[PDB]
């Protein structure tokens, strides 16, 4: 069972509002095995396969982050996200604050069991753009 990411190259013109994607997850080699989904990350007390991270330069700087997709369920614990499917490849990372978020780099960590193994770190970068 290993997990791999990709974190897709963007420029917003505008607040990037949320639930917008960021990035997918892929998941290989974990056929026929429940898989539960979340990160060893600060928790957004408000709900589950829901982050913060912190700004390598300053860690004041937020990113509010949450993994998921269509097959993709909350556990009541508040742990994660639970797929039971066997053919469940894909997954997402969604923006989860209201607007901006202030310019630095942000490491986003992600791990997959099964559940009753892998994990992965992008960093993530934000830049200003001046036109």
């Given at each position: 069972?290993?997990?791999?990411?990709?974190?897709?190259?963007?420029?917003?013109?505008?607040?990037?509002?949320?639930?917008?994607?960021?990035?997918?997850?892929?998941?290989?080699?974990?056929?026929?095995?429940?898989?539960?989904?979340?990160?060893?990350?600060?928790?957004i007390?408000?709900t589950?396969?829901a982050?913060?991270?912190?700004?390598?330069?300053?860690?004041?700087?937020?990113?509010?982050?949450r993994?998921?997709?269509?097959?993709?369920?909350?556990?009541?614990?508040?742990?994660?996200?639970?797929?039971?499917?066997?053919?469940?490849?894909?997954?997402?990372?969604?923006?989860?604050?209201?607007?901006?978020?202030?310019?630095?780099?942000?490491?986003?960590?992600?791990?997959?069991?099964?559940?009753?193994?892998?994990?992965?770190?992008?960093?993530?970068?934000?830049?200003?753009?001046?036109?």
């Amino acid at each position: 069972l290993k997990l791999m990411i990709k974190i897709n190259e963007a420029v917003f013109y505008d607040r990037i509002t949320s639930n917008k994607i960021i990035g997918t997850g892929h998941l290989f080699n974990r056929e026929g095995k429940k898989i539960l989904i979340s990160s060893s990350l600060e928790k957004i007390k408000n709900t589950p396969g829901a982050y913060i991270i912190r700004g390598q330069n300053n860690s004041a700087h937020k990113l509010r982050i949450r993994i998921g997709g269509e097959d993709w369920q909350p556990d009541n614990s508040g742990i994660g996200m639970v797929s039971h499917s066997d053919f469940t490849n894909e997954f997402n990372i969604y923006f989860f604050g209201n607007g901006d978020i202030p310019v630095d780099t942000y490491l986003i960590s992600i791990y997959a069991t099964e559940i009753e193994k892998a994990v992965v770190q992008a960093a993530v970068t934000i830049a200003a753009k001046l036109n």
